[PDB]
From a paper:
Latrophilins (ADGRLs, LPHNs) constitute a model aGPCR subfamily that play crucial roles in embryogenesis, tissue polarity, and synapse formation; their mutations are associated with numerous cancers and attention deficit-hyperactivity disorder (ADHD). ADGRL ECRs are comprised of a Lectin (Lec) domain, an Olfactomedin (Olf) domain, a stalk-like region, followed by a Hormone Binding (HormR) domain and a GAIN domain which directly precedes the seven-transmembrane helix region (7TM). Some of the most highly studied ADGRL ligands include teneurins (TENs)38,42,43,51 and fibronectin leucine-rich repeat transmembrane proteins (FLRTs), although other less studied interactions with neurexins (NRXs)53 and contactins54 have also been reported. Here, we engineered an antibody, termed LK30, that binds to the extracellular region of the aGPCR ADGRL3, and specifically acts as an agonist for ADGRL3 but not for its isoform, ADGRL1.
To elucidate the molecular basis of the interaction between LK30 and ADGRL3 ECR, we determined the crystal structure of the Lec domain of ADGRL3 (ADGRL3Lec) in complex with LK30 at 2.65 Å resolution. LK30 binds to Lec through CDRs in both HC (H1, H2, H3) and LC (L3), resulting in the total interface area of 608 Å2 (HC – 558 Å2; LC – 50 Å2) in the protein complex. This interface is mediated by aromatic and hydrophobic residues of LK30 CDRs and involves extensive hydrogen bonding and van der Waals interactions with residues in β1-β2 and β3-H1 loops at the tip of the Lec domain. Sequence conservation analysis revealed that LK30 binds to a highly conserved region on the N-terminal part of the Lec domain. We superimposed the ADGRL3Lec/LK30 complex onto the structures of the ADGRL3/TEN2 and ADGRL3/FLRT3 complexes showing the TEN binding site on the Lec domain of ADGRL overlaps almost the entire sAB epitope. Notably, LK30 binding hinders one of the previously reported salt bridges—between D67 of ADGRL3 and K1712 of TEN2 from forming. Residue S38 of ADGRL3, which has been shown to interact with a conserved N-linked glycosylation on TEN2-N1681, is located in the buried hydrophobic pocket of sAB/Lec domain interface in the LK30 complex structure. Additionally, the LK30 binding blocks the interaction between the Lec domain and residues D1737 and H1738 of TEN2, that has been shown to be crucial for the ADGRL3/TEN2 interaction. On the other hand, analysis of the FLRT binding site on the Olf domain of ADGRL3 suggests that LK30 interaction should not affect FLRT binding to ADGRL3.
Residue numbers in the entry:
A (entry chain B): 6 to 27, 31 to 215
B (entry chain A): 1 to 140, 147 to 228
C (entry chain F): 29 to 127
Write the structure that this text describes.
Amino acid sequence: TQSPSSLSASVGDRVTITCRASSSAVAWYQQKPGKAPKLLIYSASSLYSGVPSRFSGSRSGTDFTLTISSLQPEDFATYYCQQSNTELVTFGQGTKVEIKRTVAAPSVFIFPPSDSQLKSGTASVVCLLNNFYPREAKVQWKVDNALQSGNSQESVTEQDSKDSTYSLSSTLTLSKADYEKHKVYACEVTHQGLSSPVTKSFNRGEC
Amino acid sequence: EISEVQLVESGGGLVQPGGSLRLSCAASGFNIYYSSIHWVRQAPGKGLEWVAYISPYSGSTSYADSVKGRFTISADTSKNTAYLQMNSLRAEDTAVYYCARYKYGQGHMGAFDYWGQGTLVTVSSASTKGPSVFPLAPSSTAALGCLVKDYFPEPVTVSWNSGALTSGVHTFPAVLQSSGLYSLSSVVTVPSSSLGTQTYICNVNHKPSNTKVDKKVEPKSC
Amino acid sequence: VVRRELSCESYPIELRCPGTDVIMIESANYGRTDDKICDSDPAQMENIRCYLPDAYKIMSQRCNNRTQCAVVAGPDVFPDPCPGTYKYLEVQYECVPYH
């Protein structure tokens, strides 16, 4: 089980996906986040009721393919193939079709822990990356200029409906005691849209 | 009273590692006997994984090598309901489970044209906990937010100003922490001239634990 | 002219003649004679020699001397000629005038 493959495309484009999972029994499905999958094509080439005509399937040897003739706004989702392997069913790894847009730099913000949490005994420092493209981004934490690894976690949003961008939050977590041992906390952000890495920092004790 | 083909699932919930749970796929509008029932799961952010099938016509069964020996699929045609008994559950089994049908007589040769709404199974040893909320204070377009940390279980929703703030809002997906509790952040971008002029309150709802928190975020003075 | 109808197991068949005509069944089989008709699981489509000639009689009784006929191809009418093989109902018939 793998995470979906990524394909950056623009409205009007033509996408030809091939199925790797092992019959003539190939079926293709579309899924958008938070909803159950929907059948598009069954038996390699038959268009399911209610599906737009732009969707098609073909077979050339062991090569089964799903082809969208013209990408429309609601075609941007994840697509899965299915193959009947004897007494076994095998879905493909998935293709998430994302939109192409103009490179945009993130706005970077850093958040010190709340005096409230410090009492709990833990310190979370947060770095916010806002409205960038492409997704490829590097967030490096430095504590008194020591590069950090393994004590942070990140989550990234899905593409925004209007901006077609992405946002990411990275959280650095320390015990309170370790936090009270250092001074400079910084998040360095590398992204194609910044001509050089942008570093946001604060000094523990000056707010 | 008018008939319709529908697959309604039940049985999902929280389990502890090594325990057991029974999922049920009740069929309406068609007879399971003339269909093959499959269970397909999807872990958060992952692809689809077929688990098991049953064809009540001949009652043959197949199981994924990942679930063979721990999971048993069955069907009761008089109740038009298929079942998936999941014993000895392990953390890697955590995922939304969807039951699907291959209706014979239509040409589909394996296609799934109707799926269930899906039920979530969370296999983990940790226990239910209300979340702790902390401010992300703006430092002198500015940004501010709230940190929802240490909560169980998934999922939980968050709003701002009781749902009044949606432009420029980013509620980040939750990240499983090494403690086995979840944590998420919700941020908003606002004007730098709006220093206390606009009320900034975050509204946090935790339905599994019946926990509701509202936290007002303001700049910090020295 | 001979007309042909086919309906997979559990699905209904409707034989129909225009205006005031009489259905006269000429052929009727509930079972399996082809592996690429009425999709099912591969193993449930194995037997190719599944025939039920009684279907001719049963169909004639339920349809002959009528304008339209309808039979669901299943355990409601025919029995199980090849248990474990998804069956299908193939009925040939001609529309003739009344007495």
